Design a protein around this ligand. Structure first.
Ligand SMILES: CC(=O)SCCNC(=O)CCNC(=O)[C@H](O)C(C)(C)COP(=O)(O)OP(=O)(O)OC[C@H]1O[C@@H](n2cnc3c(N)ncnc32)[C@H](O)[C@@H]1OP(=O)(O)O
Lengths: 430, 328, 64, 73
């Protein structure tokens, strides 16, 4: 069966009120919402239907949050990332009298071995339940310190990939506002791991790159490149450098100019370092990701539900008809099936309406009409599916005997026992 | 020199071999194998070394497909090289095939580009279609990073106080004289503004005309990650760490799950410098503290440790000695 | 088992013949199963199988 | 005949846990691990070997001398 749908009380055409901020926040505030900070009542909406979010594995690996929720009455599995600092309490073993309880500080937006393990478990469970997965990705990467490399972080980072590659339902990754994905956190949830089901979206106030700006500056803007930049920007440095390079002045003047240049070169470093960091940040924007083709679209946060409802519904409806097509001809691949559905839509509706495909609402309504309506317009898509089925069965019969002629004389006779007299005449005459 | 006796020196300065010596070591390791196992079985007479190994280089064509090329070494235009090697071994007197993949540490050091990722993917697909083992020799420095160099050379700063830069700055911009000759390439997005009566193009998104430094490397990296995850479940996957591995280069290794690591190497996700900068003091002095053998061999990421690359290739052949030629 | 699986151009591996028999029976059962569940293609599978048969087989087809 | 091998250590072994230099008050420790008992590291190691030798395509010889799993806190 398919995932159940409710006629929800929470609309699909509303906006999300709670806006993720640059300062630390509880990720649940963006999934379920929060009470208004200034009122005694008054709920500030989040992404999902009110009251629908349900957590699992709360006190374990608190840097990542997982749960189940609903979008427009469509059940989804949810994964999100803690940005606040958490404290992990490790108890003492009474079997060792010299053991002590410890507190480990765990910063947010970072994978630890335990948080990666929890993410993996959640992915596997939600896929096996039969649910689509909504991922809200704000990971800066993996911990690389001695403890976490000793505590085997690479293994669970790899298990994440092994999990996502096997998902059979939609997986919608969204990078919220004031969120980043950096490097090692891309390669484990990239849409190219499972292109048939995974789709990635970014907000306008989101970022994505290989390294953070500071790490890129630390490699590509050394001291000498900052000085080369100073050479064409700073009026004082320019004056002194043009004077020092002027021939036939004097020895003492050259020495004084050189010392002043050294003083300015060291003095100006913090400001041009900040400039370099901004220059690096200017190439981590979602416009570049859209031009390069690593995200599907750039979304505004406030309307995102209305997008993700109508997208998700469409995908679910497509997942039905494609499945039927796959049942009609199990030898077809997914691109063939997508193109077949495209062609069927244009053929039955007309070429003037061919633009109504990349329109989630109109096509979801059309697919619903074609799949759910019976004893009515009679679902021309259904007849097309029947024709594909018939052709596949005929091809399989001919394929089976063409590889094995030695049974042909036994297959003919059986098929002349359940035909009309005119068909027997056709068999004999032809 | 111009190649081949200038890259070998650079590779040796890093504690690893040059990539195009991987086949020669391979042949010599096979020789040792034929001898080492001679005390374990009534093996037939070995082949001559000239007939012990025959191999073809896999190169990309202009479309993205593989070509089985015979060419002189050193002709590589990218940082990844791969081969199809056929050889004879004691357990397989006539026929044994593998796909070997390696980074070239001397081409734009280590780092993965879109073409390196594509070659990795195609060589792995070939291995899976043939059902034969995949061997990956990692010496890389992660994904490829970069800046838009022209823009870095031709940008200006809009200062709060041009006579005192410590009052801050408002934005970064181009002038029309320089804007008009770059923006046609979709290297930069800028918004026109009027400030102090001057027309400026304030830069809002920098794209860069050069390919292989942007988010497209993430798309590649994750792509090959999936390939490795698939290959583990279809074919034999073995990884050899010769110099170092950073980022994706380490996950690929981990996704192989059969890791041989040379002494004085490290598998890291973050370098010592970045961690010391975040923490505020010189906590770590070497990367071997972070992903060295004292860490990787005791926590089980590393299955075996060796002293040099030749012993590593031997260990590869030793493990292959126990396993079928193919999944069929 | 070794004698039955590795020997060729010899005693000719009677188990190999048994496996071929199981295979042919399976192929036949699948052909009849596919058409029985979908009669609508039967007249098209007949004709193709009369294009690569001997004349005596064609006479058997017509008479029976 | 190539096979995969898993065997059980009966002696008592010493696990040295090094200190993290980032914590100035950390100390390296010694853990005594008794023979003929499963521990999470050894159970994970056994799982990894089983998965690997299966995916290589090899039969598995297991030499079992396990008194159970460690049930301590
Ligand atoms: C893979 C992922 O998922 S993201 C992970 C990305 N990888 C990284 O973090 C890169 C790591 N950065 C480093 O530089 C590594 O610490 C090391 C080991 C390479 C540093 O080694 P060093 O001896 O300092 O090399 P150095 O910093 O001189 O780099 C050499 C040059 O190559 C370039 N370069 C170095 N590393 C990289 C890289 N990863 N990508 C692109 N270019 C690079 C630099 O521009 C540098 O400039 P130069 O020619 O003026 O020297």
């Amino acid at each position: 069966s398919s995932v159940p749908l409710l006629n929800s009380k929470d609309p699909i055409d509303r906006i999300i009120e709670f806006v993720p901020t640059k300062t630390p926040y509880d990720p649940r505030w963006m999934l379920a919402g929060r009470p208004h900070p200034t009122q005694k009542g008054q709920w500030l909406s989040g992404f999902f239907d009110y009251g629908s979010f349900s957590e699992i594995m709360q006190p374990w690996a608190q840097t990542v949050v997982v749960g189940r929720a609903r979008l427009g009455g469509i059940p989804v599995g949810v994964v999100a990332v803690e940005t606040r600092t958490v404290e992990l309490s490790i108890p003492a073993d009474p079997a060792n009298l010299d053991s002590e309880a410890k507190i480990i500080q765990q910063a947010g937006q970072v994978w630890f071995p335990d948080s990666a393990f929890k993410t993996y478990q959640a992915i596997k469970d939600f896929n096996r339940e039969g649910l689509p997965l909504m991922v809200f990705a704000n990971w800066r990467g993996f911990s690389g310190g001695m403890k976490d490399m000793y505590d085997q972080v690479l293994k669970f980072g790899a298990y994440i990939v092994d999990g996502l590659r096997e998902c059979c339902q939609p997986v919608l990754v969204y990078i919220p506002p004031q969120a980043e994905l950096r490097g090692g956190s891309w390669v484990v949830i990239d849409s190219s791991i499972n292109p048939r089901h995974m789709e990635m979206y970014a907000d306008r106030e989101s970022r994505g790159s290989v390294l953070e700006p500071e790490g890129t500056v630390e490699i590509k803007f050394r001291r000498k490149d900052l000085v080369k930049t100073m050479r064409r920007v700073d009026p004082v440095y320019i004056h002194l450098a043009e004077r020092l390079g002027t021939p036939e002045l004097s020895t003492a003047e050259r020495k004084e100019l050189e010392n002043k240049l050294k003083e300015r070169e060291e003095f100006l470093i913090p400001i041009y370092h900040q400039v370099a960091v901004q220059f690096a940040d200017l190439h981590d924007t979602p416009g570049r990701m859209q031009e390069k083709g690593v995200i599907s679209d750039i979304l505004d946060w406030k309307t995102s539900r209305t997008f993700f409802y109508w997208r998700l519904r469409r995908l679910l409806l497509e997942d039905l008809v494609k499945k039927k097509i796959h049942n009609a001809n199990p030898e077809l691949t997914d691109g063939q099936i997508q193109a077949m559905l495209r062609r069927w839509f244009v053929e039955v509706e007309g070429t003037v309406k061919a633009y109504v495909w990349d329109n989630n609402k109109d096509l979801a309504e059309w697919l619903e009409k074609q799949l759910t309506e019976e004893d009515g317009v009679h679902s021309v898509i259904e007849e097309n599916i029947k024709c594909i089925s018939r052709d596949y069965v005929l091809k399989q019969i001919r394929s089976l005997v063409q590889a094995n002629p030695e049974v042909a004389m036994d297959s003919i006779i059986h098929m002349t026992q359940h035909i009309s007299p005119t068909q027997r005449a056709e068999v004999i005459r032809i | 020199k111009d190649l081949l006796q200038s890259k070998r020196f650079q590779a040796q300065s890093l504690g690893t071999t040059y990539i195009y010596d991987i086949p020669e070591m391979f042949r010599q390791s096979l020789i040792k194998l034929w001898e080492s196992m001679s005390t374990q079985a009534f093996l037939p007479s070995p082949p001559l070394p000239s007939d012990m190994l025959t191999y073809t280089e896999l190169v990309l064509d202009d479309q993205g497909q593989l070509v089985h090329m015979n060419r002189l070494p050193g002709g590589n235009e990218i940082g990844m090289v791969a081969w199809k090697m056929t050889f004879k071994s004691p357990e397989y007197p006539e026929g044994r095939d593998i796909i070997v993949i390696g980074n070239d540490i001397t081409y734009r050091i280590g780092s993965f580009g879109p073409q390196e990722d594509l070659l990795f993917l195609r060589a792995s697909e070939l291995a899976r279609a043939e059902g034969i083992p995949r061997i990956y020799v990692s010496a890389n420095s992660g994904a490829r990073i970069g800046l838009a160099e022209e823009i870095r050379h031709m940008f200006h700063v809009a200062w709060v106080d041009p006579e005192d830069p410590y009052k801050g700055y408002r934005y970064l911009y181009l002038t029309p004289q320089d804007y008009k000759r770059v923006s046609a390439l979709n290297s930069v997005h800028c918004e026109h503004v009027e400030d102090e009566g001057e027309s400026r193009y304030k830069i809002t998104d920098i794209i860069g005309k050069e390919e292989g430094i942007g988010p497209e490397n993430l798309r590649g990296s994750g792509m090959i990650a999936g390939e490795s995850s698939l290959a583990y479940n279809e074919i034999i996957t073995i990884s050899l760490v010769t110099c170092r591995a950073i980022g994706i280069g380490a996950y690929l290794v981990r996704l192989g799950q059969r890791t041989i690591q040379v002494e004085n190497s490290h598998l890291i996700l973050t370098g010592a410098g970045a961690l010391n900068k975040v923490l505020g003091r010189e906590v770590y002095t070497s990367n071997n503290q972070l992903g060295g053998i004292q860490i990787m061999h005791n926590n089980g990421v590393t299955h075996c440790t060796v002293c040099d690359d030749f012993e590593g290739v031997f260990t590869v052949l030793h493990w292959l000695s126990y396993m079928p030629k193919s999944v069929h």
